[PDB]
Amino acid sequence: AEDITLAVVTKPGSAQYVCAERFAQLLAERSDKRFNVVLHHSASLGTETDILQQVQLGAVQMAIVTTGTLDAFVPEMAALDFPFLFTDTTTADRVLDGPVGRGLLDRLSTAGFKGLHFSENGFRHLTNSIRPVMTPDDVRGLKIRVMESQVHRELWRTLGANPTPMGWPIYAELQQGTLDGQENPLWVIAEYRLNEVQKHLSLTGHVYSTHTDLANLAWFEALPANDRRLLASCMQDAALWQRTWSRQRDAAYLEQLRTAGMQVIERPDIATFRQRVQPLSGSALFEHKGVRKALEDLMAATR
């Protein structure tokens, strides 16, 4: 078999881990064992950002990483993590799998990646150790961890938080109180036990977060066309499979976290959240042509 190295930053039972496993399985099956996927996971290889550099270098062939982390590599990706772009998965799926998302995946070539598909991370929700949050006013001052992504730092600056970008993991900082909160989908909060270091959760659903499933461009294009097709086929089916797997578990995660004692605000002030993020579309980042046109194309597609 040819071994193919695929990295994720998270652990077994996590969303991108499950997608990768399913991919590795399907690939082994469909390729009659001509390929064998070697998953690297947890913190072996550093942050998602370190991972990307390794994939860009070719020392790792494939990875599944949170899409926001790619905007350092390809600015237009930031538009995907614009707040309240998507408010349901039906719309998200159609738009991401359709020509607009596909064109954004294609333009990852500019940074030396082949973009294969989007997979699901989830709606991100806000958590903290300081007070309940209903409105943007409630986040004033809070030291909220954000991913190493330009759009996310500016987003949370715009809402009046004091955001700090930082690679995964983050639990020690939260427990040591050095950071007041963070934000992520429900599976993350549960599977990484963030409830242990975070009293509060608000269901803001502020960003619909995807993973990007990608490969080193040069390595991928040097494969025969039938194998390039074979790999895309497997990753597309893996991503579709994992969306369903994860979405089946969301409900249970919420209840798990409730049972665990988190104080949950289930309907925070979303209209006031939306208004407060309005100036972000004139951010330094979002003034850039490529980025703004990508945002516009995405929004148009939702309608």
Ligand X SMILES: CC(C)(CO)[C@@H](O)C(=O)[O-]
Nearest partner of 109 among 74, 144, 71, judged by Cα? 74
The nearer residue to ligand X, 10 or 198, going by C-beta atoms, is 10
For residue 27, which of 241, 282, 170 has the smallest C-alpha distance?
Answer: 241
Residue 7's H or E segment, with its range, is strand 2-7
Residue 184 Cβ, how far from ligand X at the closest point, in Å? 5
For the CB of residue 121, give the shortest distance to ligand X in the complex, in Å.
Answer: 5
Q: Which is nearer to ligand X, 9 or 24 (CB)?
A: 9
Nearest to 118 by CA among 86, 149, 144, 148: 86
Please, what is the minimum distance in Å from the beta carbon of residue 54 to ligand X?
A: 16
Q: Whose Cβ is closer to ligand X: residue 85's or residue 230's?
A: 85
Task: Compare residues 17 and 220 and give the one whose CB is closer to ligand X.
Answer: 17
Query: What are the DSSP E strand ranges found in 101-157?
Result: 113-123, 125-128, 145-146
DSSP letter at 159 equals: T
The CB-of-265 to ligand X minimum distance in angstroms stands at 20
* Least distance CB 182 / ligand X (angstroms): 7
State the angle between helix axes of 225-247 and 15-30 in degrees (0 to 180), rounded to the nearest 10. Answer: 140
Structure tokens given for 274:
């939306």
Residue ranges binding ligand X (CB under 6 A): 9-10, 16, 66, 121, 147, 168, 184, 188, 209
125 within 8 A of 183, measured Cβ to Cβ = yes
Q: Which CB, 123 or 168, lies closer to ligand X?
A: 168
